[PDB]
């Protein structure tokens, strides 16, 4: 996160850490969607251009975290995965189109003050909130500058109208994506960066006072660049896939 600030304690209790067993390093962010289900960017697991192809045995999930680096002794929960699911049509070849995957925890997690799930949007919640100008909030332990934070970082960014999204890049933008950031004229900055991937883009509904996950941190060009924007997988458009997997495999 660039130009963000320290998260308060318990501010984002769905925030997960994707952590490699050995070497020990932070793969990505992620989010807790129920007691045995974590949502992330498919590209944090599968990215053939970089030779990344992680399996269940490769990783750990760290929930309840605040500190990037410390083992948060009676706070964080660490889990093992039973199964990994990547969208069947995820596009790693040209644009990270669908960039979404689900991870099934080996055993359900017990909720606490620091560990709580986020809601998934319904057609109606999406329709009224995913609007240009509406701000959402991103969180992660990634680079601070296009450098690694001590605690969880947070930033509030406004959704940008499609056209502006399209006109900022040479990459083909699909409907499964949206972009967020301030305009150069706007005189407020911030963005996600390298290491924030797979974390949540969240909005608080004004109707029922609940937190909803709208986006997943996907990609960008550099971080916090004037006239550029971060790109996020549009969670609502991929919901049927999500339901599909949970219904065939869990809950």
């Amino acid at each position: 996160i660039v130009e963000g600030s320290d998260a308060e304690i318990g501010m984002s209790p769905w925030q997960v850490m994707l952590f490699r067993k050995s070497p020990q390093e932070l793969l990505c962010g992620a989010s807790l969607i129920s007691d045995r289900w974590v949502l992330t960017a498919a590209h944090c697991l599968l990215y053939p251009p970089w030779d990344k192809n992680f399996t269940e045995n490769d990783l750990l999930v760290r929930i309840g975290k605040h500190s990037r680096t410390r083992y948060e002794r009676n706070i964080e929960k660490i889990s093992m995965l039973e199964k990994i699911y990547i969208h069947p049509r995820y596009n790693w070849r040209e644009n990270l189109d669908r960039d979404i995957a689900l991870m099934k925890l080996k055993k359900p997690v017990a909720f606490s003050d620091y560990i709580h799930p986020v809601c998934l949007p319904d057609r109606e919640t999406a329709a009224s909130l995913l609007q240009a100008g509406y701000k959402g909030r991103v969180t992660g332990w990634g680079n601070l500058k296009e450098g690694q934070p001590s605690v969880l970082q947070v930033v509030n960014l406004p959704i940008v109208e499609r056209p502006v999204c399209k006109d900022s890049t040479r990459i083909r933008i699909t409907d499964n994506m949206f972009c967020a950031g301030y305009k150069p004229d706007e005189g407020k900055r911030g963005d996600a960066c390298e290491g924030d991937s797979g974390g949540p883009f969240v909005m608080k509904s004004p109707f029922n006072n609940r937190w909803y996950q709208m986006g997943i941190v996907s990609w960008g060009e550099g971080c916090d660049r004037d006239g550029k924007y971060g790109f996020y997988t549009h969670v609502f458009r991929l919901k049927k896939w999500i339901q599909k997997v949970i219904d065939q495999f869990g809950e």
């Binding site: 952590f19 070497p23 020990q24 390093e25 932070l26 793969l27 990505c28 962010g29 960017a41 590209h43 944090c44 990215y47 970089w50 990344k52 750990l60 990037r68 680096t69 410390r70 083992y71 660490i78 990270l96 992660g140 332990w141 990634g142 680079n143 450098g147 690694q148 996600a192 390298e194 290491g195 924030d196 991937s197 797979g198 974390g199 941190v217 996907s218 990609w219 960008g220 060009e221 550099g222």
Partner: peptide, 15 residues
């Protein structure tokens, strides 16, 4: 540019 590594392989505490 993909989110694709928090780096470190260093300052991490033992799990």
């Amino acid at each position: 540019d993909p989110x694709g590594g928090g780096g470190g392989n260093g300052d991490f505490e033992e799990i």
